[PDB]
Write a structure and sequence with these properties.
Organism of A: Bos taurus
Structural class of chain A: mainly alpha
Helix content of chain A: 55-70%
Largest sheet of chain A: none
Radius of gyration of chain D: 23 Å
Helix content of chain D: 40-55%
Shape of chain D: globular
Largest sheet of chain D: 6 strands, mixed
Distance between the termini of chain A: 43 Å
Number of domains of chain A: 1
Structural class of chain D: alpha+beta
Chains: A mainly alpha (98), B alpha+beta (411), C little secondary structure (32), D alpha+beta (444)
CATH class of chain A: Mainly Alpha
CATH architecture of chain A: Orthogonal Bundle
PDB class: membrane protein
Number of helices of chain D: 17
CATH superfamily of the largest domain in chain D: Metalloenzyme, LuxS/M16 peptidase-like
CATH architecture of the largest domain in chain D: 2-Layer Sandwich
Largest interface: B-D, 52 and 50 residues
Oligomer: part of a larger assembly
Entry title: CryoEM structure of bovine cytochrome bc1 in complex with the anti-malarial inhibitor SCR0911
Chain A: Cytochrome b-c1 complex subunit 7
Number of helices of chain A: 4
Shape of chain A: globular
Number of strands of chain D: 12
Radius of gyration of chain A: 16 Å
Number of domains of chain D: 2
Strand order of the largest sheet of chain D: 1-2-6-3-5-4
Keywords: Cryo-EM, Membrane protein, cytochrome bc1
Distance between the termini of chain D: 48 Å
């Protein structure tokens, strides 16, 4: 079943093994930075640590124990609510020109 | 046509006057000025004057800005210590657009925090610009002295609250004062039941000026002294207040002629008899629902203001004693009858007079009746008016080089 | 003051087509 | 009850003329107030270098006594009636007017005769106002905006009267006489060149009975060559760069030659300017504005302010823009400003033109709100155009606009022309005129 397949792919990717969430990985982009800038300080300052920890792991070419890995059901989509807003704003700017 | 007028059971007001003008004009007045701010959420209303043209539940900040400009309309905000005002202009073939934008700003704004934070330093601009005009220092520092809490609040955010105003305070301030009971929707070149349709559809929703007196002295580097001296007044609507309004013009509340010598201004002449050095002076008359203020505003040099203020103080003093004649008073009436009618001449200045009454009264006062109230004023009331200025406790404020400036008690 | 400021004569250098203050320069701009 | 139907119900304007050549007009409305005044075809353009400032000097003494209302007696009657009184002057036109009530018309007209007719020009007052006006110039030395345009006209319109200021040099202010003024007044103030006009709660017919009563006495004639005529004036392409680093901001003004009043393409240009619009640092739109100039300026903080003007003279004018900016931000502005001009000369869309048209509609309507600006529109239009144009006809002229019109007209008057430039303050970054001129075209 597809849900089980989504789950396996998640563990196969391995950014749970570095304690990261999904939205921590998205390609730095204009629509994204706008969304990041709008984050609150609590959620943002957590994003920075999830990253800076992970980089400190890949430098050492190590990972965390299974107890700290990110769980699929716990994969928080903290950035999409703000990002889907921004992309909506962009299409209005384009549609308004047309 | 005649000005329609009514009220809703939820306490909301509507008017309408289809003037057949090409351009409509709509204005949503309200009793949510700066007096409704406590010491904690100061600067709130200054942010709201700028918080228009931000995101809403009904539309985004981009749609509002361009959608207005695409039809060439306009959006403007005016505030007082009591009232606020959201106003538009457009062509009467474009009314329904501007309303949908107008109400989404008023009714249901979101005030998303990042837009707010990008807007905060704009306060430092709009403030410091308007404080180039030195009066704004004086008047603001004046109300801080005469009054304690409510009307002493500044329209302009103080420097320490910059970047500290939250959206939380706003939505609270919205819900706490943006109520249907306090509003008054007005439209010109527009039919009455339209605004009824809009208001019923959308707008159908849910401190004292204690006088104290005192003095402020803002020593600055400037050759000219700006100064004022006032006393407690009567609130608007009182026939008592009309007496001040007459007394305002008897003294001379600014020139009617370009570069004229203010021949009839008793103050400017009384000062001229003593002083022979460039000066200016005029009657100050502020009125409010709870209270008001009256006195005169001063402009002089650093080494001559102490003579100017005393001369003005004495000219008012003699008039309080009884030195006043009917034709002098009759002249000020002709001035006052003119000042009112000339103010409401435009659609805009009219629009401010309509809803101000509508919030402060259950019905519009026609201007002809206002003229009758002017004629009702007696000369003795104008004298007793001046007695209050002299006898009542004072409030003072200045700014400039105060090396030679007196105090209240020396006057 | 600033109103006392006035331009001097460039007519020694100006083109002959534009030495008449009373005429509109546009007519020969195409040629200039 | 549409926009067009409101234009239909606009009050038609009345006109007339006296036997002595004087023109009369009015507009009736249901107002209780009314504005009435005089508008003259006189200004500094008609002045020589030796009477430069006279027409401004008269603006003071006209309200300082007459043969029948000497001294401040005049002022006492105005304030007695509660009316206002006001004046202004231009390089072409001068006007006195009263703002008063509907009933107080026959006294308003009564004074405007005694003001124009019987200005005593007391020698004592001539020397007082002489000192005052020298004090005004020192104040206007600080009004940096007024300086630039005065520098601007000096350079665009070299060797002509239009280079002069309304106020003229301080020298002539010091070196003036009563005789110089009586010459100026006895020459220019003639009924044919003048206009009475009004608006508000009055009637045309009421105005005539007073005009004949008072204004029948004007000199409706003149000698064989007493009244001058205006020739065209020589625009030229030039620059003036008044360097003053001590001052914190930098005013700039660039422009070109204009059509004139009566030229019909003025309409299209008012749109083109309106597309660019105008900006201050107090406007809350910011980036989301429509004018891509205003959008960029609010984003990058390239400036504090700018605008778009079209000054129209008898057969020419200035067309361009004014702007304020920090000394480290000029070069960015003149690269975007010229870009938008050349953008329009090459490619403009109906949407933004339509956006501009809707602005021009509202401005004319919104400008005509009150008895005062209406009778202004009457007065000068009767001097500039000879008649008045109703908003129905303006709309009709607007209707013939589209993108094609704008591309052409701007290409006539922006593309590859020789502009006038002015600067005042730390203008070190200002591109030299060959770079300004280099950007007045594209390689596209």
């Amino acid at each position: 079943w597809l849900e089980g397949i989504r789950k396996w792919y998640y563990n196969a990717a391995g950014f749970n093994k570095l304690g990261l969430m999904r939205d921590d990985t998205i390609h730095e982009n204009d629509d994204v930075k706008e969304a990041i800038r709008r984050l609150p300080e609590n959620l943002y300052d957590d994003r920075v640590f999830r990253i800076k920890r992970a980089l400190d792991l890949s430098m050492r070419q190590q990972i965390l124990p299974k107890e700290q890995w990110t769980k699929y059901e716990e994969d928080k989509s903290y950035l999409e609510p703000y990002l889907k807003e921004v992309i909506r704003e962009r299409k209005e700017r384009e549609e308004w020109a047309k | 046509q005649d000005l329609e007028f009514t009220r809703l059971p939820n306490g909301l007001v509507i008017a309408s006057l289809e003037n057949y003008a090409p351009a409509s004009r709509i204005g949503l007045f309200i009793k949510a000025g700066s007096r409704y701010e406590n010491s904690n959420n100061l600067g709130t209303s200054h942010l709201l004057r700028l918080a228009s043209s931000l995101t809403t539940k009904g539309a985004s900040s981009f749609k509002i800005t361009r959608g207005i400009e695409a039809v060439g309309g306009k959006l403007s905000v005016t505030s007082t210590r009591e009232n606020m005002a959201y106003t538009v202009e457009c062509l009467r073939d474009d009314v329904d657009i501007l309303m949908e934008f107008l109400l989404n700003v008023t009714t249901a704004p979101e005030f998303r925090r990042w837009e707010v934070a990008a807007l905060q330093p704009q306060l430092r601009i709009d403030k410091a610009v308007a404080l180039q005009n030195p009066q704004a220092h004086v008047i603001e520092n004046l109300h801080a002295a005469a009054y304690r809490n409510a009307l002493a609040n500044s329209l302009y955010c103080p420097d320490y609250r910059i970047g500290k105003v939250t959206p939380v305070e706003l939505h609270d301030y919205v819900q706490n004062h943006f109520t249907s009971a306090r509003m008054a929707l007005i439209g010109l070149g527009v039919s009455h039941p339209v605004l009824k349709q809009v208001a019923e559809q959308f707008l159908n929703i849910r401190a004292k000026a204690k006088y104290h007196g005192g003095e402020i002295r803002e020593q600055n580097g400037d050759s000219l002294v700006h100064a004022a001296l006032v006393a407690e007044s009567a609130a608007i609507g009182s026939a008592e207040a009309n007496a001040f309004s007459v007394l305002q013009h008897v003294l001379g509340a600014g020139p009617h002629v370009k570069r004229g010598s203010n021949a009839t201004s008793s103050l400017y002449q009384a000062v001229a008899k003593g002083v022979h050095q460039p000066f200016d002076v005029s009657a100050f008359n502020a009125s409010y629902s709870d209270s008001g203020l009256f006195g005169f505003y001063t402009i002089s040099q650093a080494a001559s203001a102490g003579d100017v203020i005393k001369a003005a103080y004495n000219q008012v003093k003699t008039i309080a004693q009884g030195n006043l004649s009917n034709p002098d008073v009759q002249a000020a009436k002709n001035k006052l009858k003119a000042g009112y009618l000339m103010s409401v001449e435009s659609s805009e200045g009219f629009l401010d007079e309509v809803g101000s009454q509508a919030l402060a009264a259950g019905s519009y006062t026609p201007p002809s009746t206002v003229l009758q109230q002017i004629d009702a004023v007696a000369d003795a009331d104008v004298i007793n008016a001046a007695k209050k200025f002299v006898s009542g406790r004072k409030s003072m404020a200045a700014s400039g080089n105060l090396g030679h400036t007196p105090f209240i008690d020396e006057l | 003051s600033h109103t006392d400021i006035k331009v001097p004569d460039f007519s020694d250098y100006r083109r002959p087509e534009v030495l008449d203050s009373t005429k509109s320069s546009k007519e020969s701009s195409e040629a200039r | 009850a549409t926009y067009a139907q409101a234009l239909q119900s606009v009050p038609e304007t009345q006109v007339s003329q006296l036997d002595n050549g004087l023109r009369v007009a009015s507009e009736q409305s249901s107002q209780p107030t009314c504005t009435v005044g005089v508008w003259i075809d006189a200004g500094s353009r008609y002045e020589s270098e030796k009477n430069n400032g006279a027409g401004y000097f008269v603006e003071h003494l006209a309200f300082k006594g007459t043969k029948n209302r000497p001294g401040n007696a005049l002022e006492k009657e105005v304030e007695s009636m509660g009316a206002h009184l006001n004046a202004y002057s231009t390089r072409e036109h001068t006007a006195y007017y009263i703002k008063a009530l509907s009933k107080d018309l026959p006294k308003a007209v009564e004074l405007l005769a005694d003001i124009v007719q019987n200005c005593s020009l007391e020698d004592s007052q001539i020397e007082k106002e002489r000192d005052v006006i020298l004090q005004e110039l020192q104040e206007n030395d600080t009004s940096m905006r007024d300086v630039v345009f005065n520098y601007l006209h000096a350079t665009a319109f070299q060797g002509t009267p239009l280079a002069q200021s309304v106020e003229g040099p301080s020298e002539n202010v010091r070196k003036l006489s009563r005789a110089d003024l009586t010459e100026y007044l006895s020459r220019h103030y003639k009924a044919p060149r003048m206009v009475l006009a009004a608006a508000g709660g009055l009637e045309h017919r009421q105005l005539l009975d007073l005009a004949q009563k008072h204004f029948s006495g004007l000199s409706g004639t003149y000698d064989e060559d007493a009244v001058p005529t205006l020739s065209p004036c020589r625009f030229t392409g030039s620059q003036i760069c008044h360097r003053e680093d001590g001052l914190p901001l930098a005013h700039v003004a660039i422009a070109v030659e204009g059509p004139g009043w009566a030229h019909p393409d003025n309409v299209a240009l008012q749109v083109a300017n309106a597309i660019i619009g105008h900006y201050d640092c107090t406007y809350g739109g910011g980036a989301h504005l429509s004018s891509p100039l205003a959008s960029i300026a609010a984003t990058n903080k390239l400036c504090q302010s700018f605008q778009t003007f079209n000054i129209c003279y008898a057969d020419t004018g200035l067309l361009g823009a004014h702007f304020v900016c920090d000394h480290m931000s000029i070069d960015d502005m003149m690269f975007v400003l010229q870009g938008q001009w050349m953008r329009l000369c090459t490619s403009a869309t109906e949407s933004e033109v339509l956006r501009g048209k809707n602005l021009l509609r509202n401005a004319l309507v919104s400008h005509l709100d009150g008895t005062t600006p209406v009778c202004e529109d009457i007065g000068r239009s009767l001097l500039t155009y000879g008649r008045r144009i109703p908003l129905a006809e303006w709309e009709s002229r607007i209707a013939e606009v589209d993108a094609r019109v704008v591309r052409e007209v701007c290409s006539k008057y922006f593309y590859d022309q020789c502009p006038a430039v002015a600067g005042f303050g730390p203008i070190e970054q200002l591109p030299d005129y060959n770079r300004i001129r280099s950007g007045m075209f594209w390689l596209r």
